[PDB]
């Protein structure tokens, strides 16, 4: 439809994890120990962090990403400890398709301006105040 | 206003980050450029600010303080910079020198009808 807003930006991505026996794979899940997925939270388990560095960032993994499925079997509405079994029975290899949701300024003209109805999501740009 | 809706968890933080010559504020700062349709924006619960933390470097300053990805910059130094441009919030966070005050929002959603973490450290 016409008009502005903060649309959805859904960032999918599927990742190989990889690790030895004596390592983890360097994040920490959080979620859920009648639920219906969205775009706000499209899945009951995220990362709630990801540590720098270790085999997840390396691979690309960050916090906030949403499990979407481990090991190609779907865990959108499976809770804490069962996911958790899932990782556990991979072992040291993890096939994980997680996805990113950020909300995005869209300035698309509203109804009976005679414009496009596509997003028009504003341009954004990064600067690094990091010391490397 | 009852029964369901759209829940967002913000959590509003005003920290001093004070680095050394050596070190940055370590973040990654990211957001709207300057240019013609930011004067169209209007902050929301679902995005607060132009510009947010693309990333907070591990153990760094702006770390230690707190700050993570995906919080919004209200305040730079005392001065709102909710609509404020990529370049001029950069511009005042240089102009701070080695220190920052900056205030920010984080903000959160609830599943749609309790958590529990694990690590794999």
């Given at each position: 439809?016409m008009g502005?807003?903060?649309?959805?930006?859904?960032?999918e991505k599927?990742?190989?994890?990889?690790?030895?026996?004596?390592?983890?794979?360097g994040?920490?899940?959080?979620?859920a120990?009648e639920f219906?997925?969205?775009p706000?939270?499209?899945?009951l388990?995220?990362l709630e962090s990801?540590?720098?560095?270790?085999?997840?960032?390396r691979?690309?993994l960050?916090?906030g990403?949403?499990?979407?499925?481990?090991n190609g079997?779907?865990?959108v509405?499976v809770?804490h400890?069962?996911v958790?079994?899932?990782?556990?029975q991979?072992?040291?290899?993890l096939?994980?398709?997680v996805?990113m949701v950020?909300?995005?300024?869209d300035?698309?003209?509203?109804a009976?301006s005679?414009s496009g109805?596509f997003?028009?999501?504003?341009?954004?740009?990064s600067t690094?105040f990091?010391?490397t």
């Amino acid at each position: 439809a016409m008009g502005p807003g903060s649309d959805y930006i859904i960032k999918e991505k599927t990742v190989l994890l990889q690790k030895k026996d004596s390592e983890g794979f360097g994040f920490v899940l959080r979620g859920a120990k009648e639920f219906t997925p969205t775009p706000a939270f499209p899945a009951l388990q995220y990362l709630e962090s990801v540590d720098e560095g270790g085999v997840a960032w390396r691979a690309g993994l960050r916090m906030g990403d949403f499990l979407i499925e481990v090991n190609g079997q779907n865990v959108v509405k499976v809770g804490h400890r069962q996911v958790v079994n899932m990782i556990r029975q991979g072992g040291n290899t993890l096939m994980v398709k997680v996805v990113m949701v950020t909300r995005h300024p869209d300035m698309d003209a509203a109804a009976g301006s005679g414009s496009g109805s596509f997003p028009e999501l504003i341009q954004d740009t990064s600067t690094s105040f990091s010391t490397t």
